[PDB]
Amino acid sequence: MLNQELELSLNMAFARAREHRHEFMTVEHLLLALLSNPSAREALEACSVDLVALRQELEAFIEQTTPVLPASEEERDTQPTLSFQRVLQRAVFHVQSSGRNEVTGANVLVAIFSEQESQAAYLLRKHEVSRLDVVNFISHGT
Amino acid sequence: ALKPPSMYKVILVNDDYTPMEFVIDVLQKFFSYDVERATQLMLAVHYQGKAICGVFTAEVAETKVAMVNKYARENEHPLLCTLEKA
């Protein structure tokens, strides 16, 4: 089960991908919607992330590459890339092996790092963040 | 030291049992082609042996390859869809 906030952030980015009529919702869509998620950004801020240079780089890349539906037919709905599906699952599955009943934004953030061929991850890694870093912050704070 | 993730070509591989109309349909449904081009591309597949249907981010292509392959599987034909690095 996902925490109220994460689910907001999801419904948020989803609702955005329909308004711009994007065929697929990617990780990049996610990592991005994550940028304005309490739990997520705290971690990011804590790693000294340019919350603005990211947002740009992502918004920008989401654009150049996300196929858009033909204005013609509406018998199609935003399909989650496989990568999205996987991130989301690696996070639910971990929050599950910790007993705590709710998955947090940061929980998902850590997940993204594991989709090694996504941009969202290359971005995060370009901004000097690392899984450890995010994880270290969530486990203790430092 | 690090590089943004490659782009992937999404290929269609010819086979002797898949009906061409299916291939054409797959091309139209999953790649937004009009009949003119769709039929051509099919002819490539058929005579070339394979054909590049489009080029996307690895993250996306993996997904198109999966959808095309299922549809194939669901409509009971061996039409193979693959991907390659740009």
Q: Are strands A79-80 and B7-13 parallel, antiparallel or unpaired?
A: unpaired
B49 to chain A nearest CA, in Å?
27
What is the crossing angle of helices A38-46 and A27-35, to 10°? Answer: 80
Which tokens belong to A78? 């935003």
Q: Do B59 and A126 touch (CB under 8 A)?
A: no
Question: Which domains are seen in chain A, by residue range?
Answer: 1-142 (1.10.1780.10)
Q: Do A115 and B4 touch (CB under 8 A)?
A: no
Q: CB of A29 within 8 A of CB of A123?
A: no
What experiment produced this structure? Answer: X-ray
Q: Is A103 helix (H, G, I), strand (E, B) or coil?
A: strand
Q: CB of B1 within 8 A of CB of A125?
A: no
Q: Do B2 and A126 touch (CB under 8 A)?
A: yes
Interface test with A, best of B8, B59, B70, B84 (most A CBs within 10 A): B59
DSSP B10-64: EEEE--SSS-HHHHHHHHHHHH---HHHHHHHHHHHHHHSEEEEEEEEHHHHHHH
| CA atoms of B44 and B46, how far apart (whole Å) | 5
| CA atoms of A54 and A58, how far apart (whole Å) | 6
Nearest CA to B25 out of B17, B16, B15, B35 is that of B35
> What are the b/e assignments for B25-64, b being 16+ CB within 10 Å?
bbbbebbbbeeeebbebbeebbeeeebebbebbbbbbbbb
| CA atoms of A26 and A114, how far apart (whole Å) | 14
Q: CB of A20 within 8 A of CB of A53?
A: no
Q: Are strands A24-25 and B7-13 parallel, antiparallel or unpaired?
A: unpaired
Q: What are the domain boundaries of chain B?
A: 1-86
Beta carbon pairs, A and B, within 8 Å: 45
Q: Do B60 and A24 touch (CB under 8 A)?
A: yes
Cα A47-A31-B2 angle, rounded to 5 deg: 70
Q: CB of B10 within 8 A of CB of B32?
A: no
Q: Out of A27, A81, A125, name the one closest to residue B2 (CB).
A: A125
A80 to chain B nearest CA, in Å?
9
Interface of B with A in 3-42 (CB under 8 A): 3-6, 32
Residue B54 one-letter amino acid: G
Q: Where are the alpha helices (DSSP H) in A20-69?
A: 27-35, 38-46, 51-65
Q: CB of A54 within 8 A of CB of A45?
A: no
Query: CB burial class (10 A; 0-12, 13-18, 19+) of residue A137?
Result: buried
Task: Enumerate residues 6+ apart whose C-beta is below 8 A from B2.
Answer: A122, A125, A126
CA dihedral (A120, A77, B65, B58) in degrees, to 10, reads -10
Nearest CA to A44 out of A140, A133, A118, A126 is that of A133
Rg, C-alpha atoms of chain A: 15
The CATH fold assigned to B1-86 is: Ribosomal Protein L30; Chain: A, (3.30.1390)
**In units of Å, what resolution does this entry have?**
3.3
